[PDB]
Amino acid sequence: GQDYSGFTLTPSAQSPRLLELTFTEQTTKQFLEQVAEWPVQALEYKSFLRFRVAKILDDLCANQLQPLLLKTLLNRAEGALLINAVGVDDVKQADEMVKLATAVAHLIGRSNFDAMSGQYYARFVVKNVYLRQPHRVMELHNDGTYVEEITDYVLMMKIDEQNMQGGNSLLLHLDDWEHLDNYFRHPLARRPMRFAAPPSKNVSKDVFHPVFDVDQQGRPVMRYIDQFVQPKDFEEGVWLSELSDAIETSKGILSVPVPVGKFLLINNLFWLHGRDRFTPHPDLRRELMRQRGYFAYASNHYQTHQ
Template sequence: MNMVKSDLVKSFEHFNVVQHPQSNRLYHIELKDEAVAAFLEKHRDTSPQQLEYIPYRRYVIANDLRKVLGEDFSKMINEVLHDREFGGFTLGIGKVASSDEDYVKFATAITHLIGGVNFDAMSGKYYARFTVKDTDNSDSYLRQAYRLFTLHTDGTFVDEPCDWLLMMKFAEENASGGESRLLHLDDWEELDYYANHPVASTKIPYKSPASKNVSKTVYNNTFYEHNGKTCIQFIDQFAYPDTIEQAEYLKSLSESMESSSAVVELELPVGSLVVLNNTFWLHGRAAFEKHPDLHRELLRQRGYFKKV
């Protein structure tokens, strides 16, 4: 079944839009090298620190990216992310970018065409960079390479909207496995059963571990409705159910999603990013194969859609 809209799959002056080879729920955007180079050259002297310290500069570079790629680019990525049938895209700049700073600037420009970013308490910035390696003493599965990082949505333990998520791969060495695992809520075979379960509308306490630097407990329904469609908030590691019934429900729900035939194991090359609507896409990570010199570095930004 091919659901991709033909009016979006086409060529523009500075980019092309194609169906993602691994999912008919995702688009892939092929940027013209000269356009990416023009944007990076314009901001050669812009530093990530300036973007951290002067928030309005994030929107300035977003506007410059819009000028380079054209208004159609901004309209297209927002249309895709808001469209319940799709809600995600990938693109890459690895052939043109020459530094981690380029990646930070480009990712920031993308996210600020979408909306505003949430403060990431784990890093103390508006974005987080983190590594996955052979050994780690982390208090969550985020950095633990040889465990399945189960399907979840971001922002379950913060008291603010988390509409979208961007992940970008900065570096990777000696990595086999570790694919990004994605599940579109509407492709999950047992969605109706779990969304209509008595526990589905129960407010579950969520608490984060120490590394997240968030001490407040928040309470979320597992399922909720937005624009007449079912959405989800869930992560197994940080849920603190109050009853055996709630715990059994969450365990069964997680196991059902993990075993879904609709899970996509996404290949994301270095210098590439994926952006997802966080209200109906779940994401996780497959386990890596053991290697003493395993190294992967990722960037994460997440936030809210711009007010229309």
């Protein structure tokens, strides 16, 4: 897999659509040196620092990182990366992991406020383990379905993993989904359906949008999640239960281990993600970090006025 300045990039073992990007040891060391003056707390309080750490990392890769991240994420044939930095691979370096993921995400867009943490990222710990039963699979879905704005990317980092069996990230690229055409050509694929937010501590209003939509070239994209979609009647409800089964039993699903220090960064429009079951263990300890946001990048394109 191609050799770039400051990192290497190779196809994963689960699929050619998922590329593995690894920052070299030298790059990692220099980046950590160069962002040491800003604790994670500074990035939380001053959002411009999230972009600044991104600039520092991209400059360390001779400005080849930003364009490669964008090309990969916007490429319909790919759209997903598994990213890591040599030397960042233990729970003790959680702050460095956050800085690294923040730098990468802010070269391609901006991470949105997360209601679970009150910050631009959220860290979650699973230990001492309906929705949190270890034997339960978290079904494949897209993020951001209960708000008006589109979530373009999902970032999921493994911060810690102790006594963990299973729990791989599940992924499904729409073009690997064998039932795509059947569901996409159904009239219900284009009908606006109600999507309702969870608890919501005084934060929302229901939104309406179809389960499928199209990209700029007319190819199918999805905005689906079983828990938040609210079928209005028996017609919508039975169809969605069939859609759900068609997605969950798809032969195109990928099962991707995400070792400590690594993170998945995927295009949320044509990739769905979920999580496999895992075995309970008294000393199990799993810590994750997530960021979700929109893409924001430059291109030669039209404008009006001056």
